[PDB]
Amino acid sequence: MRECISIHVGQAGVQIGNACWELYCLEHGIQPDGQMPSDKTIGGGDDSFNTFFSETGAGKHVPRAVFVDLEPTVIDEVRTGTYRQLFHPEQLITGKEDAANNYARGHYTIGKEIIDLVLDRIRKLADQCTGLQGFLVFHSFGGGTGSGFTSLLMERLSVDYGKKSKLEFSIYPAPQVSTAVVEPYNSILTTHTTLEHSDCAFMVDNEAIYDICRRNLDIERPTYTNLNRLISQIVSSITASLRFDGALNVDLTEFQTNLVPYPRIHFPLATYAPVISAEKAYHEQLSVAEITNACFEPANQMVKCDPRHGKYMACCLLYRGDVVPKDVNAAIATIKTKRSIQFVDWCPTGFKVGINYQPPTVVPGGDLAKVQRAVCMLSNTTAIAEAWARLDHKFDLMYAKRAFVHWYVGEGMEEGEFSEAREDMAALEKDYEEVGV
């Protein structure tokens, strides 16, 4: 049993973390006070769920998690939260003044002063780890803390835990809920600095989540609460293999092995189905072939883009609930002839499949219907590069006029770090381009 430490950074990472950890407790049957009756071993054990939960001699199951933010408003919501008894004070790190949506502020000014403290609380966790695999890092692209401080923490984590894996869950900026005009700046800056430091990153485009929340869940103006509950489901199905008995992706390193042939191209596209509205809890029960076919419909992707116009280099299918291998094979055979699925030449046209018999858990009073079977497909297609392009374009529009740049220079960042990061991205776009056709 190798442990995993989850690190939640800034508002998005924090609020999403809370939604995820709530779900984990429900999935593992853990009470909001840390008690878990289902657990027969008291004071410890090497069970699968111990990769995410420590155990105190008193029987409290404590998340291997650390929440960090430069403003106390969001962390406090965790302290007064339903699952507050889970966490202890050392896990929640909070500053006084935030990064004001300024990458330079999160990275250089504020970051420098709080980095050691965050590392100490992180070390306190690792110190309780028999065989730490590495870290799961949640954060947004657009925020000053999520972009600026995350990149610094990643740089340090590489130094202090050299032989440990780091995966990200990154929230990609969408103006439909975006709170800042400089998010394209912060995005490129943090992607540039984190790139050589992240083994595998799952981008989630708020545009996609927001749209799914409207179309599938019938919601006029989706809340972060609404978005974060859907995001937590997907994160849950991506992490399920680390928390339950299995053979597919039981280690953080297996994630890069199966999904990332090329180090720099480490952003797999996630697609999820089915998403049903709970208010109408009388719906038709989708089949294995149907939810599988839905993974290739752009409208269920975490990032809106067209996989038909790129190449795959790895594809993993994660099923939850009532599913046997027999049906998956039939569903894949029929879909292959039916849809445009083109792998890179130096890769076998193959699908890795995992099935967890336990059906997806829903939060009570939530917005999602419970379903007897769901699937999350992780696929490394070059099509996701569309996102990088979109983002680089908006960056170029502003930077040509040096708009908002003085805010960054004023924090001690040199202007050269902009053109440095943008060149790195142009290079990245080229890498997808090469692989893509």
């Binding site: 006084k96 004001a100 949506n101 709170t179 005009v181 103006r221």
Partner: protein
């Protein structure tokens, strides 16, 4: 936290400022005695941003009232909500400034300034995490303009990394007041360009036009104008006084509104003008609805922050917004993607239920500054009324300097259109 320290200076500053505290007291549920009588406990959530708490559940406006003559501030003290201000936060002189920037900035102002900063320093010492400062004043006069800007320079020196915000009433040739307004406004604009992060620009010519043409008021008074201003001051501070994600604090607002450091002069707008969604959205974006003279169609918008307030679909608000972004179309810069942001607050202003507030960083404001520049030049070349300034020790060169600083500002706006 995060607390804002409010400073109001001069006649205009204190009269506009006093009304502002009236309207937002009435929104946070604070009575003229400082007791809370609000129905929703949602008002109390961000109350700390503008109020200190004392014994006996008393809420006291973190505000400093400053003048060089006792007049206006005795009028505040005797006015409604007069007693809610700390007695000790009244700082005033006896000599007056005589509408003279030099007196406000260099002589009479200098004698009073330190004791103003003593009050400022004691209000800040009581802040868990001080956010910055908000100054209300006019530019046309002597105390608000001259001593207001001296204050800003002092504040900056002591609090170098706090946001400095101001609501600044500019003079117009349409509205006759002191003959030396062009001198005072010009000397002040340079101060603002250097030492504030955000300046809301309004002038009485535009507020007059609104009160006259829109509100059908034959002959407007200070009372009528200040009603508009106080309402607009409530709107653009909505995002600071109630829970929300967009423009949460001053620094984040500044980061989203200010592409280039020197261009931080905003034109505010309000709807409905007080004496449907599409109608409400149409007004606030209307040219004849701006709080300053310049026509927004003469330039482009670098950034726009719209705050809707009340109970509304917001589905349609998103619709109406984009209907404006495309109906105008030509008036938004294309090199700042998604430069129009929309915020929404549930609690509507007193007696409206529905409301909107416009905040535009428009290059069209350059006309405002060019106009004042031409006035200043017309006078300065004849050296008319100049002896009131050199009499206080000012050099002619300092005038030539502020003139070209002005033209520089007008030129910088010119680059971006």
């Amino acid at each position: 936290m995060r607390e804002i320290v409010h400073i109001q200076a001069g006649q205009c500053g204190n009269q506009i400022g006093a009304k502002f505290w009236e309207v937002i007291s009435d929104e946070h549920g604070i009575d003229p005695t400082g007791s809370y009588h609000g129905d929703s406990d949602l008002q109390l959530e961000r109350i700390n941003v503008y109020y200190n708490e004392a014994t006996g559940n008393k809420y006291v406006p973190r505000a400093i009232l400053v003048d060089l003559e006792p007049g206006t501030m005795d009028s505040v003290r005797s006015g409604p909500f007069g007693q809610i201000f700390r007695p000790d936060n009244f700082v005033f002189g006896q000599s007056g400034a005589g509408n003279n920037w030099a007196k406000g900035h260099y002589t009479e102002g200098a004698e009073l300034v330190d004791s103003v900063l003593d009050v400022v320093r004691k209000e800040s010492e009581s802040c868990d995490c001080l956010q910055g400062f908000q100054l209300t004043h006019s530019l046309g006069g002597g105390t608000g303009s001259g001593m207001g800007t001296l204050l800003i320079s002092k504040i900056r020196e002591e609090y170098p990394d706090r946001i400095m915000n101001t609501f600044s009433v500019m003079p117009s040739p349409k509205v006759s007041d002191t003959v030396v307004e062009p001198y005072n406004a010009t000397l002040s604009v340079h101060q603002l360009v250097e030492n504030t992060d955000e300046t809301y620009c309004i002038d009485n010519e535009a507020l007059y036009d609104i009160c006259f043409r829109t509100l059908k008021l034959t002959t407007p008074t200070y009372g009528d104008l200040n009603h508009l201003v106080s309402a607009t001051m409530s709107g653009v501070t909505t995002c600071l006084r109630f829970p929300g994600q967009l423009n949460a604090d001053l620094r984040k607002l500044a980061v989203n509104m200010v592409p280039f450091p020197r261009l931080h002069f905003f034109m505010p707008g309000f709807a409905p003008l007080t004496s449907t969604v599409p109608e409400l959205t149409q007004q606030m974006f209307d040219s004849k609805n701006m709080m300053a003279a310049c026509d927004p169609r003469h330039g482009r918008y670098l950034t726009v922050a719209a705050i809707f307030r009340g109970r509304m679909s917001m589905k349609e608000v998103d619709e109406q917004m984009l209907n404006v972004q495309n109906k105008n179309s030509s008036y938004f810069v294309e090199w700042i993607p998604n430069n129009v942001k929309t915020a929404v607050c549930d609690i509507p202003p007193r007696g409206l239920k529905m409301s909107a507030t416009f905040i535009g960083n428009s290059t069209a404001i350059q006309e405002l500054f060019k106009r004042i520049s031409e006035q200043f030049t017309a006078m300065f070349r004849r050296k008319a009324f100049l002896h009131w300034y050199t009499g206080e020790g000012m050099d002619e060169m300092e005038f030539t300097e502020a003139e070209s600083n002005m033209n520089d500002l007008v030129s910088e706006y010119q680059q971006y259109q």
